[PDB]
Amino acid sequence: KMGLLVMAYGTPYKEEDIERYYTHIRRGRKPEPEMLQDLKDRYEAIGGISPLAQITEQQAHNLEQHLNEIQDEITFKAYIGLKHIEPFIEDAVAEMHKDGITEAVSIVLAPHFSTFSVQSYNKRAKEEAEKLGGLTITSVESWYDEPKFVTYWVDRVKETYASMPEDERENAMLIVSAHSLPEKIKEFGDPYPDQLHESAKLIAEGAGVSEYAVGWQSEGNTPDPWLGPDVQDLTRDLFEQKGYQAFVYVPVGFVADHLEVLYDNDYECKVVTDDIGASYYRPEMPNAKPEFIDALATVVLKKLGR
Ligand SMILES: CCC1=C(C)c2cc3c(CC)c(C)c(cc4nc(cc5[nH]c(cc1n2)c(C)c5CCC(=O)O)C(CCC(=O)O)=C4C)n3C
Ligand SMILES: [Mg+2]
């Protein structure tokens, strides 16, 4: 029986947990009253926070189920480990250890590798495992290039373009994005930017979409500069240059209908498209769909030489 450590940034499971979540993100400092209310309002704006955390749970549960279904050599047991929400990464490793797991494979629910979003999680997981002893973790570092994942987005893009009216179909711009990170990741030779670019190329080329651009979104508010351009500004700049009648957003860096997609794209990017008179398109996120889960299972098996 092998452990399957599924990690992610995390989202509050209950509305009452938002402040604590924010505090964790701010490394021990409670958010200012208004700052807190603003975040609460965004969750409200997208229909409520309750559904969100459940997607990650379903992704982990479905992945476990699928992996035990498609092959009969290994019996996987999933453990979710989150960065800012309990169960925390260390606690997940602690439970695997307590459960008797001696070997585990880990995967982060973010296809592109980055020092802040994949490496830090893997590092924290392995250090805790080392500390407890008798537990070896093999970690997936990036999977944006898994053919099945690329195909998922390629098909979603094909469907969207094939369904647009003529005026729009030949005057559209595809914007491929991921979550922005501080520019200082460059001090570590972080390939994150390169991977998003390759991810965009693979998808646009597979879909036969010639007009596309790479952008970043959801940057946090700190004194340091984050990766740009932001999808909002990119959309406007491109419209000003070519006057596109439609924009298709593929937030490939994200795997589910969370705040970044439902708000930063579906609301903020549509505000821009609405403002310049262009149509807004944003294909279905992977969430816990069978096609996506099978892509993840493949990534895990390949990592294990299976
Ligand atoms: C890529 C995954 C990712 C997601 C999703 C994410 C989400 C997110 C949320 C949830 C809506 C909130 C309230 C904030 C909002 C924020 N997010 C961060 C800080 C970060 N946010 C980060 C990453 C990150 N943040 C990283 C990495 C940092 C730390 C960067 C660094 O070390 O300098 C801050 C700064 C908090 C502080 O004051 O320390 C705010 C605000 N972020 C951007
Ligand atoms: Mg924002």
UniProtKB/Swiss-Prot annotation:
Ligand binding (Mg(2+)): E16, R42, D264, E268
Major localization listed first in the record, in broad terms: cytoplasm
Domain of life of the organism encoding this protein: Bacteria
Regulation: Stimulated by Mg(2+). Inhibited by Cd(2+). Inhibited by N-methylmesoporphyrin (N-MeMP) and 2,4-disulfonic acid deuteroporphyrin IX (dSDP).
GO molecular function, one term: metal ion binding
Cellular localization per UniProt: Cytoplasm
GO cellular component term, pick one: cytoplasm
UniProt effect for mutating H179 to A/C: Loss of activity
Gene3D superfamilies: 3.40.50.1400
Residue positions binding Fe(2+): H179, E260
Catalysed reactions, semicolon-separated: Fe-coproporphyrin III + 2 H(+) = coproporphyrin III + Fe(2+)
pH dependence, entry free text: Optimum pH is 7.2 with Zn(2+) and protoporphyrin IX as substrates.
A Pfam family recorded for this sequence: Ferrochelatase
Function summary: Involved in coproporphyrin-dependent heme b biosynthesis. Catalyzes the insertion of ferrous iron into coproporphyrin III to form Fe-coproporphyrin III. It can also insert iron into protoporphyrin IX. Has weaker activity with 2,4 disulfonate, deuteroporphyrin and 2,4 hydroxyethyl. In vitro, can also use Zn(2+) or Cu(2+).
Record's subunit section: Monomer. Interacts with frataxin/Fra.
Protein name in UniProt: Coproporphyrin III ferrochelatase
